[PDB]
């Protein structure tokens, strides 16, 4: 089991922090499904990888 | 056994934000999903059931939505009392299963830890064991790492640590790490060092003490 | 009709990174989801089918998972040769629908563009049209902004940008914007400027010239 560190980087300045636990790919996938819910009111987004992939930044526009 | 996937595991927000906690079920459950809130050392409290009906005494900022296999709990605007851990639960069929829970913490700004090291008390050194303690005060975020060194020797499987809950005032954390060993091993080394790492540190901070030097 | 939704649209990762991309459906497609890789100017290449079966001659670092409505593609370790776009496809029923795609690009350190501006050529002028070109050379990220101003007057609806794909040697980008006017219109103004905003620049940069003075 692993923990995915995710910086929820909103356009209007705010940065929310979240952690997803599970198999690397189950958490990462859950991470995106999450950002997919936020985008429904936060706007389309983009992502970049840090820490070999265990950390991901999701910037909304 | 209907599988419950509650996410995120933890979330850091600041008073006033909109919070969204989702719960996904393996198979349909119609609407029989319930949300509970729990605080340190306290019994949980029912928040919403039937996926959307609120329990009396619950502030309208708490709403629920969803049917079938996907549900969402929404806190319109995060309040100080809203910081806690949240759990979803299906009650469609036995066995009842809970979500893994989502811990909603108070986001604050970076803050470096104050470190201290303590030699095992001599009164304890007669009991055979000798624990070396190293405390890290008020820091944020929660991620911190302590690495013990005896005469420059990395140590494994002989240290334990505990992290306090977010402080009521400054929303920071503290950490106690103990390197437990024996007067059999303790008295055979001199340099006892504690190496700390945190996002607030540019390079690892160290605190040590050579035995029989105080 | 089945709508395919991949995630994320684009991702920036470094060599040797662990990558997992997404693809979800409106309705269940069981296990009949497929993945393809496509590089600039080349046709698509089948990588995985039936959600998790490797096509022959496809590195083992590539993987698949999912069933029903949610799927994933995983690359245990990003290889220099793995940077491209990946399309998920549904084959459960007609119409056979594809996903928008996920473009995976090379992450690297922030580089500021070095700007340049070109006034229209003489023979192009003699033919009635005047086209001004501005060039942001070798920058990273790809997000960039060009503000066209003719005599300090912000322009709109008369320019067209154009960007290269990352470079094989330094993973950077390059963009070209072309403001287009009629010789008649080009000869009614003096200062032609181009203001570039980028993360690598401390302050937006502006490059301009004076009609005829080149």
């Amino acid at each position: 089991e692993v923990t995915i560190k995710v910086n929820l980087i909103f356009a209007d300045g705010k940065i929310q922090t979240a952690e997803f636990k599970g198999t690397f790919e189950e958490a990462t996938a859950e991470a995106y499904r999450y950002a997919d819910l936020l985008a429904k009111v936060n706007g389309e987004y983009t992502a970049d990888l840090e820490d070999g992939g265990n950390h991901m930044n999701i910037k909304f526009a | 056994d209907i599988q419950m996937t509650q996410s995120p595991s933890s979330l850091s927000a600041s008073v006033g934000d909109r919070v969204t906690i989702t719960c996904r079920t393996s198979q349909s459950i119609s609407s029989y999903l319930n949300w509970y809130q729990q605080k340190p050392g306290k019994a949980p409290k029912l928040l919403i059931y039937a996926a959307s009906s609120l329990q009396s005494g619950v502030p309208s900022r708490f709403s629920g939505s969803g049917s079938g296999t996907d549900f969402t709990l929404t806190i319109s605007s995060l309040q100080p009392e809203d910081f806690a851990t949240y759990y979803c639960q299906q009650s469609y069929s036995t066995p009842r299963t809970f979500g893994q829970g989502t811990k909603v913490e108070i986001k604050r700004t970076v803050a470096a830890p104050s470190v201290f090291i303590f030699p095992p008390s001599d009164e304890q050194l007669k009991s055979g064991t000798a624990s070396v303690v190293c405390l890290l005060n008020n820091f944020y975020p929660r991620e911190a790492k302590v690495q013990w060194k005896v005469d420059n020797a990395l140590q494994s499987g002989n240290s334990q640590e505990s992290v306090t809950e977010q402080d009521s005032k400054d929303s920071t954390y503290s950490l106690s790490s103990t390197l437990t060993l024996s007067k059999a091993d303790y008295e055979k080394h001199k340099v006892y060092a504690c190496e700390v790492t945190h996002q607030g540190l540019s390079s690892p901070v160290t605190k040590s003490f050579n035995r029989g030097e105080c | 009709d089945i709508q395919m939704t991949q995630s994320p649209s684009s991702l920036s990762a470094s060599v040797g990174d662990r990558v997992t991309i997404t693809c979800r459906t409106s309705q269940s497609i069981s296990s009949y989801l497929n993945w393809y890789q496509q590089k600039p100017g080349k046709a698509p290449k089948l990588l995985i089918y039936a959600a998790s079966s490797l096509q022959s001659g496809v590195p083992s670092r590539f993987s698949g998972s999912g069933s029903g409505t949610d799927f994933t593609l995983t690359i245990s370790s990003l290889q220099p040769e793995d940077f491209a776009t990946y399309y998920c496809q549904q084959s459960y029923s007609t119409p056979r629908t594809f996903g928008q795609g996920t473009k995976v690009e090379i992450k690297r350190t922030v580089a500021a563009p070095s700007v340049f501006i070109f006034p229209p050529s003489d023979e192009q002028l003699k033919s009635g049209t005047a086209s001004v070109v501005c060039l942001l050379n070798n920058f990273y990220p790809r997000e960039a902004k060009v503000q066209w101003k003719v005599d300090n007057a912000l322009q709109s609806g008369n320019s067209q940008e154009s960007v290269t794909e990352q470079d094989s040697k330094d993973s950077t980008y390059s963009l070209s914007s072309t403001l287009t006017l009629s010789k008649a219109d080009y000869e009614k103004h003096k200062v032609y400027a181009c203001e570039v905003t980028h993360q690598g620049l401390s302050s937006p940069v502006t490059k301009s010239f004076n009609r005829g003075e080149c």
């Binding site: - | 019994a43 029912l46 329990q55 036995t94 066995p95 009842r96 829970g101 030699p119 640590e161 | -």
Partner: protein
């Protein structure tokens, strides 16, 4: 004015047995189906089981199925959980909850504060305090106590409170428990702890 009082927890050896109690008041016990839910140190919530109003039905989580038996006595308005073949994984806090209304789907509207069931090879015992001083921050180490139910409190020589009290959770080592408390003071004091198996205080010196 609903109330549910769980009781019966305590330190127990692997394999032995324990029966838990939960008193109900503030409602017609007889008409509602009860439940048991537990929570291991530092972990989520885990459904234990349930029993309908006439005990007509019972169900259990596969974890305790076969090993646990739930029961009730409406006459004396109290709920019961019999635990056999106790394991370490059983070490947790046990909660009882009623259901909001008349249905299998009903949510657990009211919970009690639970009882602590500690499954260990050791016998319950009081902590042994040791001072933490430098080589300003003084500390106190509570060594080898069980179950994990300790509390710290400080006092100066002029016996009154010591404000800067900071406490960290317990660590499990060798079937027993250990915890530390730190007291910060500006540039001896008396450490004091409470435990169901004996309260004790120590004297921590100032450098």
């Amino acid at each position: 004015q609903v109330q549910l009082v769980e009781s019966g927890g305590g330190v127990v050896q692997p394999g032995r047995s324990l029966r838990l109690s939960c008193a109900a008041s503030g409602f017609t016990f007889s008409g509602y189906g009860m439940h048991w839910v537990r929570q291991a140190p530092g972990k989520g919530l885990e459904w234990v089981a349930l029993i309908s109003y006439d005990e007509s039905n019972k169900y259990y989580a596969d974890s305790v199925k076969g090993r646990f038996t739930i029961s009730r006595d409406n006459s004396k308005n109290t709920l019961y959980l019999q635990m056999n073949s106790l394991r370490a994984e059983d070490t947790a806090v046990y909660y009882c909850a009623k259901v909001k209304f008349y249905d299998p789907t009903a949510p657990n509207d009211y919970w009690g504060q639970g009882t602590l069931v500690t499954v260990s090879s050791g016998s319950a015992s009081a902590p042994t305090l040791f001072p933490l001083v430098s080589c300003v921050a003084v500390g106190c180490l509570a060594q080898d106590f069980l179950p994990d139910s300790i509390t710290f409190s400080w006092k100066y020589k002029n016996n009154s409170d010591i404000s800067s009290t900071r406490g960290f959770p317990s660590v499990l080592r060798g079937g027993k428990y250990a915890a530390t408390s730190q007291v910060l003071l500006p540039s001896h004091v008396v450490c004091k702890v409470q435990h169901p198996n004996g309260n004790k205080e120590k004297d921590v010196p100032l450098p």
